[PDB]
Amino acid sequence: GAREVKLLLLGAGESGKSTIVKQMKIIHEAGYSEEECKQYKAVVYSNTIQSIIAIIRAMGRLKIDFGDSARADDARQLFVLAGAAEEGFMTAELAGVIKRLWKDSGVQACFNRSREYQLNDSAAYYLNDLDRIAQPNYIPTQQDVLRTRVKTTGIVETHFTFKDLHFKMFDVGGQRSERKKWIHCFEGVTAIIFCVALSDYDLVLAEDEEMNRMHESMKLFDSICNNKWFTDTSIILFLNKKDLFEEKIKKSPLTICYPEYAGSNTYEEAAAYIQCQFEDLNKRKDTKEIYTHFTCATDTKNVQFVFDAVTDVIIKNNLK
Template identity: 30%
Template sequence: MGVMVSSQRAERAAKKRSDAIQRTIQSERRRGRQADILLLGSGGDEIVHHFRRDKLAHKGYSETEIEPYKRAIILNTMEYLKSFLDVSTPLDISLSPESSAWRDIIATQLCPGDSKNISSESIKALHDLWHDPAVQLKFIHRTPNSLDKNTLYYLESIDRITDTVYRPNDDDIIYCRSYNTIDEAFPTEGLVYRFLDGRRIKGNKKKWWPCFDGADIIIYGVDLADYDQVLYENGPNKMEENLRAFEEVCNSRWFLPISIILLLNNSGLSPDKLSSSPLKDYFSDYEEGDDCYAASQYFQKKFVSLNKRRTSRDIYSHFVSADDTKILKGVSYSSEVLFVMDIIQRNMIRVVQCFEY
């Protein structure tokens, strides 16, 4: 009798363990249908733009969904204008005392931990600072290709963005960079893509990393044309800073099991740029002159070599070029989007299979 009771208890315990395992498998399978993607570095925009365009073309955005974009767009534009004024150009300018005060108002609005509300004073400061004749002169005489597409788009839209009845249009939403760590999810056939934007975090980014250790993929973007740019006036070189940050991400214990997609945007590299601003002046070990292909390969090797966990981490690198698109099922995809979607889908299949066997 005692043996029978003991056997029944063992069977119940085994079934309980089996049920728990099955629940875990089902949970992981469901999770396998959602890819949590962490955006770092300075790129990765195009894949987010792709999903926003797709949503706008089909379901669209409700007024409730649009409201956070409005705030983010205004803050993006303030940051773009401030960054533009911080960087030296062939025509340096001196702001009037009034314009300097407007600049300080914008800087205060952008301070970490500031109120979520955007003051009417800071919106007026954005409008008036942009229309300062000295700022306009600096904008006209800026270095060719010194502003990325997003920055140029929003700076040229300041009058519309600062209007009292401003409502973001489709392009405003598409090109918006999430402010702080806002995330977006886009359901597609078979997989939900959820983006966590860590590119705008201020201060010490390392303290945020434990919050992102559940990510499935990291997309780290780099603009190769930034090799001769600085983060701010008299500040560190942008490319050196990207290399330092990428090395930290690659070798962080928080991101150890996570694959990294390295997107290297070489569309801004040209023989003219490499001749007028020699890469060797900034990276003394470069020896290939104005050869764009060699410059791209140089940076690819430099970034990938920073990974000290080659046996336990995959890094997928891809060059991003302007107008590099393909048509699939009547939809235009950039090579960047196709590459990223393929890597993500393959990684998510691998995650699910690990729990199936």
């Protein structure tokens, strides 16, 4: 009989939970039709503008000047044009204002110091494709839709059948929940997919945090996998944004996150070191097994392959 498979996505904000949900829709559901894609044009532009604005705000805070003094008027114009722009369309005026700012060396300098503030990882994706996106005849591709960031109102869920299993994937993400709500989310969970943004390793400590983002994530993973209530639940670990981590490891040493790291700064040793940090938190290596996969949630092919392997685990873990 097609038993129910309740999947709970957990992890810090921006770790890729929403993205995994949309990949399921693209992989095991109907995905997005062109008509549905056109519907995202407005959020694509909103996200694009929010991104350039985030970088501009950081320049003021970090005190980074524009490569060209003229860009200051563009920045102000950016705010007025955006505030009057109709949702869904981008004028040649706003497009130019954004292209000039994104091009500015000062803006790029701030963009490259994103570890010092909080910039969404879709910023570069859209900002680099201003040629394609700005055109009035623009039709968001499936990948563009995947990259959109939307308003998270309450628990999100998605249904889909895979290998004669009724998957119910839940993501509480963001929406602050009460003890009751969480207990309800946990009861019935067949497997937990814990997402981690590998690229968060070089993030500057916030004013009110005792430990860096990576260690906060480790603290939570520690409570989850060692909690007796999940003894039988499959604990899947997604070390995500491996693509961003790989790009970063070149310039920002892992020693930023783990001052004790004495390995080399290759993608391989740094990633392995992080895999061990999380997996070693398991206090019952004899009993529980952690199923780790390095991912790129925005890569449908990779997610498909990985979710395929997670399913095989769910099946056999069902002592059958």
